[PDB]
Paper text:
A conspicuous exception is the interaction of monosialotetrahexosylganglioside (GM1) with the carbohydrate-recognition domain of cholera toxin from Vibrio cholerae: this is one of the strongest protein–carbohydrate interactions known. A conspicuous exception is the interaction of the human ganglioside GM1 with the B subunit pentamer of cholera toxin (CTB5) from Vibrio cholerae, an interaction for which affinities in the range from KD = 4.6 × 10–10 M8a to KD = 5.0 × 10–8 M8b have been reported.
The OH → F substitution at C2 of the terminal galactose led to a change in conformation. The quasi-axial arrangement of the C(sp3)–F bond of the d-galactose enables a Dunitz–Diederich-type interaction15a,35 with the adjacent GalNAc C(sp2)=O (3.4 Å).
Author numbering:
A (entry chain B), B (entry chain A), C (entry chain J), D (entry chain I), E (entry chain C): 1 to 103
Write the structure that this text describes.
Amino acid sequence: TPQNITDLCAEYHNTQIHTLNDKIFSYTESLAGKREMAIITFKNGATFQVEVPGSQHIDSQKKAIERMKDTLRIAYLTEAKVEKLCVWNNKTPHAIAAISMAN
Amino acid sequence: TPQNITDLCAEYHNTQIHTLNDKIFSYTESLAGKREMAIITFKNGATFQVEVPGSQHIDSQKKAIERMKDTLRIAYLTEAKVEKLCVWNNKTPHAIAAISMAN
Amino acid sequence: TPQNITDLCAEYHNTQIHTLNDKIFSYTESLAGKREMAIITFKNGATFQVEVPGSQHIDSQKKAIERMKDTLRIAYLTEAKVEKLCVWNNKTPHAIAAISMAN
Amino acid sequence: TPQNITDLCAEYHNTQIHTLNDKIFSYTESLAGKREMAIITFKNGATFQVEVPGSQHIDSQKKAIERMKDTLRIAYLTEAKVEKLCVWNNKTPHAIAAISMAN
Amino acid sequence: TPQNITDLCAEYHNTQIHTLNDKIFSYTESLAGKREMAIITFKNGATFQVEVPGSQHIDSQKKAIERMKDTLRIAYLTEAKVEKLCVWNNKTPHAIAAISMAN
């Protein structure tokens, strides 16, 4: 069981770590069919998505996808600093697998 | 997969972007039968709804609809600046498909 | 489709609008069986409930009843000004159908 | 239908009202099997639980049990003043049935 | 039924109490399949996880695991002081069984 976001991100090829140490610049949320997703950006220009839940996601993952969108919204609205994002780099925007918040 | 609300909105028919760059002026919600909905207004008069859930709303739209109502409520209470809305404009009040917030 | 809380309230029999323009004075919540409800009051002594879910409600209302209790709790804790309430006046305490918040 | 927590408490056997008029000193929460519960304390020593969901609860209470734990958690973090608690006194710690918060 | 986290912790095997009396330093969350988990750390270097739900967890534990991650997130964002953690010391990181917060 990984002890931090780096070790978890290492479990996957084609994921990569981004260190932002910054608050989210914008938060975008959609309920449109087949675009039930979230998109965040940072002032450095970086853009990331939470994937649309699909048949490729087991049910436990779909539930965690909903959690992640909860986390990003309240992080945005509290101006909480994001430390790192672990993101799949084979999707555009890169897709969030894990997030850390610290200080 | 789009990277922002404007490109996401261009992927559908019967949608348009509204640019507000303002906080929500009023939040209204109802539990009354057949009107289980939320309504928001802006000081310029613009009025929008989150639609009552129905049979046109498909799989994971059901969760996204509830999340949107959560988001509008917490956005209203935090006075978060709303940047743009993607809305379905074949309904009145315009039905929100997506929202973007930027400081 | 109604555009605001007053038009919405007009669509139902035995309802009326209370214009409070004030924060919630008390929030009360119960989990006891058959009394799973919420009660709020205002400075002026006005008392309102969120009814227990029962046979008078249709399936579409079930999530909305839970949302409304969420809304009243966070409204109370933020000291948010509630503008109007649409209530069924054939219940005691009057039963909330819709809420608007502005300011 | 009762109009306040005191009237609601009197509708049940083995209940009593505690008047605290104080914020919550401590919030404890457990996910261990058979102890999925919450325990709160006040500064005077009073200790109360939200019971583990079991057969003694009707289905309607399950949702309300989860809500009560949500409410105690956020009440604690916001240092909200708890007015009164309705509890079952045939359980140790006394088990919460209803809570009133008042400004 | 135990009256505090220390007594609750003693009911289980392979558990131990950690007394932190500090806010959470970092909150980490993953949505990767079969890694749906949360990790928190404190400035004393202690690292703890909320376990991935599965097998070891009955029905009521699943709900409680999700609640626990909700609680740690909002505790982190509010910088609430956590008093103690009851953890299974037969997992790495030690897995959280219960949390106490005291203000």
